[PDB]
Amino acid sequence: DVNTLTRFVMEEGRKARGTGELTQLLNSLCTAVKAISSAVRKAGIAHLYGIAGKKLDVLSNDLVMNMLKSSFATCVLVSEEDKHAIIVEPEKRGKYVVCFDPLDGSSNIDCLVSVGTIFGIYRKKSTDEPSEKDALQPGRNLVAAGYALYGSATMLVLAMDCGVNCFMLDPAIGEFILVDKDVKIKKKGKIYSLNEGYAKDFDPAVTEYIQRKKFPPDNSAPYGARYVGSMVADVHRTLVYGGIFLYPANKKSPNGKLRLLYECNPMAYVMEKAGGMATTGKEAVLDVIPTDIHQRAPVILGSPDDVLEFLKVYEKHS
Amino acid sequence: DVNTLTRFVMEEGRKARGTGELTQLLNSLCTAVKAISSAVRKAGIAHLYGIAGKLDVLSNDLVMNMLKSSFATCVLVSEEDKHAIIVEPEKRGKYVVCFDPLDGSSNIDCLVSVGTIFGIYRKKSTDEPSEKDALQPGRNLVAAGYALYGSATMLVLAMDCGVNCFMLDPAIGEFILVDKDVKIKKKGKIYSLNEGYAKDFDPAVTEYIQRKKFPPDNSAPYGARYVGSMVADVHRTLVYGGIFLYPANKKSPNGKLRLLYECNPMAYVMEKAGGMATTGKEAVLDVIPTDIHQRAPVILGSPDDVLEFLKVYEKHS
Amino acid sequence: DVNTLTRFVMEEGRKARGTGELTQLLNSLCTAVKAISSAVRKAGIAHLYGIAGVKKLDVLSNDLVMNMLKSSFATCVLVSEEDKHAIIVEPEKRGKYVVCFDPLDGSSNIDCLVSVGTIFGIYRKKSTDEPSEKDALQPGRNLVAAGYALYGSATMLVLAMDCGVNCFMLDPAIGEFILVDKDVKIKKKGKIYSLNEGYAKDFDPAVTEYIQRKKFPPDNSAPYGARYVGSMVADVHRTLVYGGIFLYPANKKSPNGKLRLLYECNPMAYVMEKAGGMATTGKEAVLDVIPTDIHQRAPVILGSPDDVLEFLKVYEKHS
Amino acid sequence: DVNTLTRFVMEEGRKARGTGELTQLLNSLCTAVKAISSAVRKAGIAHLYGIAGKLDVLSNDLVMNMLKSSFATCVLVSEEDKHAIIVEPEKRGKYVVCFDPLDGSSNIDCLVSVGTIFGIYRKKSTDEPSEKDALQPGRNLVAAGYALYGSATMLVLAMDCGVNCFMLDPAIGEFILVDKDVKIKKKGKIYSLNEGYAKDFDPAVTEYIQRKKFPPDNSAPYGARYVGSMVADVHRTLVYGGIFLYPANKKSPNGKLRLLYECNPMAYVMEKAGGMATTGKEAVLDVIPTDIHQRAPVILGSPDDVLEFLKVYEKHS
Ligand SMILES: O=C(NCCCCCCCNC(=O)NS(=O)(=O)c1cccc(Cl)c1)NS(=O)(=O)c1cccc(Cl)c1
C-alpha cells in the first residue's frame, strides 16, 4: 500500500505510544522542505525578472525556523545560517532541539549543483533554561536525522531507530511518497568521493588509502571517482550505490571542514542506521562531544568494508 | 524587459529575416524539455506507487515526437537509437538534430543532475534524408545547447549571437532569460575528470593533473569537482571557469563520450562563450564524423586551461 | 502562526486527547483531495494528447478516496456515490470510522470546466456488530466531521467539526492546505437565491411562492440576485460565503428531491449548521432524517437562517 | 500529432505569410494567462500567511506588461483602467488590444470561475496612437477569445480560421490543443441569465423566458444555469449549447456588460463558432462604440436559440 511521510510518521508514532510531538515537528519540517524545494526549482522566478512590470539560503532558513517554532515541538534551534542558537519563545516551546543546514551546498547553487536540507533532532536533556548548551549533545543521542535532496528529483531520507526510509516528493501533489524502505548500504562499494584538489595537504593515511583505490594492491579493478562538492549529493549517492565519502582535515581546515552538529552528525546517524560507518579517523562521528555549535569535524563515511579498510590504513600510520 | 525563450528565439528570427522554421523547432524542443523536467522531478510518482489503488526512453519519446511534429526536421540522431530516425516525408523540414535526451541518467537512481544535450544542423544536400546528413563537423552547427535538470531546470542555448541561459519557472512553464550572452573565465580554478581511473591515464593527463594539484609555483592548487554527469560538469565549467576532461587513453584512443550529441554540442557552447574544446589533437568541432555514434576525446573549458593542457599534451606527443 | 490542515487537525486532536485515528483519516483524505485537484486541473493532459507519441475523473476520484481512506487504518465502512453497496474495509485495515462521500460531485458537466468538488461526512461505527451497510444508516446529527473540497478558481477544503467551520486554501506550489478563514459563520440573511428555475412548471406551490417573493418583494425591499452554478459544491460554498439560500426541493415528479442524503445533503447540512445556518427538507431538519437506504434522496433548502425560516413560513402556509 | 498554442499560432502565421508580430502578441498573452492561472489557483498563498515568518490588479499588470514588451501593441484598453494605455514609442507595434484581465473577480471570494477576455484589432492609420483607435466595431476584430480558470484552465482562441480550444497542462506550463475548429450546437437546452432582475425585464425577455419554462411546442423545459461569471457562462454555452443573456434593466439601462472587452470578444468567438450575439436591435459586432467603457446588452449562443429570442423581440418592436 501507498505510504506517505505523514502516514508513516504517524504510524511509527502510534506504535511507539508517543504523544505525537515528534510527528508535529516532522510534519512541520516536511512542509518546510516542500516550500524549500519549490523555491530551489525556481517557481515564480518570472516575477523576479519583471513579468508583471530573499536570497535562497536566507529564505530556506526562514522556512525551517518558522515551521519548527510554530510546531510547538522545539526549544532550541541551531542553524548553519545563524551565529548563535535560536531559543524558541516560551509559548511555543516543546521538548526537541534541532540542528539543521537549511540549504547545504548553496554556496555553488549558481551552477545548479544539487543542494540539500540536513537535519538532526535531539530530545532536550537538561532541565535548565533552554540555551545553546542544549545542542551540544553527541550524535549518539540523536532521536532522528536525515536530509532532503533537491537533485534531479526531491527526496527526503529519514533515519530513526526503526531504520532508514526514503520518500520521493511528488510535486504534482506535494506529497512525500515512501519508495525505499528500511534501506541498508552495500557492505562494500566501488566509488570513492573527495576533493583530491587538496592532495598536497593530505596526511599520509588519506594519501595511501586513495592510492589503494586507484592502484589496488590485489590487482582488482580501481574504484571510480565522484565528487559533486555538495554533501547531501555525495552522501546520498554513497548510501544508494555504496562506497566511501571523505572530507579530511586540510591546512585550511585543520579541524576538518564540515560542521559536526548539522552536517556530520545527521549523515553519520543515517549511515549507521543503514549499516554503514562514519568516523573522524580517531573516533565515530557520533561519539564526538561538541563544545561549540559551529565546530567542524573531519569525516570518512560510507560502506563498512571501505571505512574499515580506511581505518586499517589510518592505524598503520598510527 | 522580461524575456522568455519563445520571445527570444522569435526576435532573433525576425532580425535574421528567417521563415520561422528554426523557431518552430526550438519551441518544440523547449516543449519537450519542460515535459522531461516534469518527469525527472517525478510529478505523478504517487500513481506508480498506488495512491489510486523508462525515464530515458520517455525522454527520448518526448524529444523525438516534438521534433518530428515541428515540421522543421528531417533526420534525428539520438543516443538512444541505433540508427538515425528519418522523419516522414509529410513532416520534413530542413534541419538535422542530434541529441542525448537524458545524459547522466545511468545513475539517476542516486538523483544526480541529468540533462538533455542537442545540436542542430542545416541539411546540406538535396539527397533523400539519411544518416549521412548528420555526419557534419560541429563547425556546421546552427544551434546547440543543453537542458540541465539540477537544483533548477535551465536551458543553455548557443547560436551565432552567443550563449544565452534561460531558467524554467515551473509555476508557468516559461524559460526566463536570466544570463545573457555569457562568456567563460579566461582561466579557472577547478579541474574535472574521473581520477579513479588514473592508472589508465595518458602520460600527458597524469602530468597535467599532477600540476593542478602540485603547482610548480606559489599558486593555489585547483579544486576538483566531478559529478559524472556531463551536462552538470560542463555547465559548472561554464559558470565557474576551469577544465573538464574526458580524454583519450590506450584502451580508449577515441575517448568515450559521443561526438555527435555530447562532445560537439558542448564544444560549440564553449566556443560561443569564448572557451575551447579539444580532442588533444584538434578542435572537437573540426572532427568530420564517419559514424553517428563515434566517440571523441574531449577537453574543454577556460582557454588558458585548455591551452595549458595542450602544452602538456604536446610535450608527450 | 501559519496553520496547515495537518497541524490544525493534530492540535484539535490533542485538545480532545484523541488516539489520532481521525487525524489519520483526515490526513488520508487530504492526500486524495490534492490528487483529485491535480487530475481536475489537468496535470499530464499533454500525455493524453500524444506529446510522447485514461480513466474518467469521477472514476479516478472514487479510486483515490477509496484507496486513501482504506489505507488510513481508520475506516470500516465506506459509502460512495459510485458504488451500489457499502464497501467493507478488510479486517487488517479496519478502523472505527464510517465515511460517506461523493468523490467528484458535479462532474457530469465537467466538460464545460464547471466547478466540481468532493463531499464527505464521517461517523463512528455505533454497533458492536461486524461492520456492514447498516452502520452507514445514521442520521446526520451523528456526524463527527463533514465537509467538501471545492475545485474552483482555487481548491479549498472546508472542514466542519464540533469546533466549527474552518476553510483551508490548497497551495499547489507546496501541496499544503493553509487555514485562511477560521470559525466561519454564515450571514443571518443573504441577498441571493439559488435553484434551477428552468423547471418552474414542476415547482411546489410553496417554492413557487417563495421564489416570487424573492423576485417581486411585497415590501419595497430590493429583489434578490439569482445564481445557480449547477454544481452543488460551488453553490453551497457561495451560500456559506455571501449568504442566501440554496434550493433543491421536493416536487410532484420527485417527492424526495434529487440530491442524495448520505453523501450530499447531510454534509452540507452539517457544515451549514456549524456555521450558524440552516438546512431543511421542508418538513424537518435534513440532519434529523434517519435514512433506510444509503443512496436515498432527500430534498434540501439551506443557507442563511432568516432565508430558510422565511421559506418554511411560506411552506407551512401551504401546509 | 500533439499541438500546442505556441505551435498552432506560429503555423497559422506561416500559412498567412505574416511577419510574426501577431504571434508575438499571442505568445505574450499566452504567458500572461499562465501566470494569471498560477495566481488564481493560489500558488504561493502560504507565503502570504506567514510560512516563512490585488488579484485583479496583478492580472492587469501581467497582461499589460506582457503585451507592452511584445513589441506588437500600441493601444491597450482594460476594464481596470479609466483611459486607454498608450504604449511608449520604443515598444510600439501595430495592434490594439481591449481586455478584461480577470472577468468575474468581484466574487472570486467564493472561488467562482473567473476568466480573461481579450479582443485584438489592427491599427491601419498613420496617426499617433490614441484612445480612439480602440473605438472600432467588433466586426473589425483580427482575433479574440478568453481564458477560463474553472476546474481546469482553458484558452479559447477565435480567428478567421475558426475557434480552437487549448487546455493548460500545469505539469509543463503548456496549452495543448484539445478541441479544433469548434462549432456550437444549432440549438441547446440551457438558458442563462440573472432572473433576480425579473421585475426589471423588458417584456420581450419576460416572454422568452416564459417559453423556456413552458414550451409552446410541448418540448422539454430548458434547464437554467447562471454562474454569474461571464466566461464560465459563455463557455458552458459554447460547449453545451443554449443561450446567454444580459439584457438592459433598471440598474443597467444599457446592459451591464462592457462592449469592447466582454461583449465584442464573446460575440466574435460565438460568430466564429457558428453562433450569434445580439444586442436585440443589431449584432453586437456591428455596434460602433463612442466610449471605450460603454455597456451593451448581449444575447448570445446557439443560432436557433438566438433567433427564437429575436423572434420574440421583433414582436414587442
Ligand atoms: O506520533 C506519535 N504518536 C501518534 C500521534 C499522537 C499525537 C498526535 C495526534 C493528536 N490526537 C488526535 O489527532 N486524535 S484524533 O485523531 O482522535 C482527533 C480528535 C479530535 C479532532 C481531530 Cl481533527 C482528531 N508520537 S511521537 O510523535 O512522539 C513519535 C514517536 C516515535 C516515532 C515518531 Cl515518527 C513519532
Ligand SMILES: O=C(NCCCCCCCNC(=O)NS(=O)(=O)c1cccc(Cl)c1)NS(=O)(=O)c1cccc(Cl)c1
Ligand atoms: O524566427 C524566425 N523569424 C521570425 C519569425 C516571426 C515571423 C514569421 C512567423 C510566422 N508568421 C506569423 O505568425 N505571422 S503573423 O504573426 O502576422 C500571423 C498571421 C496569421 C495568424 C497568426 Cl496567429 C499570426 N526565423 S528562424 O526561425 O529561421 C531563426 C533565424 C535566426 C535565429 C533564430 Cl532563433 C531563428
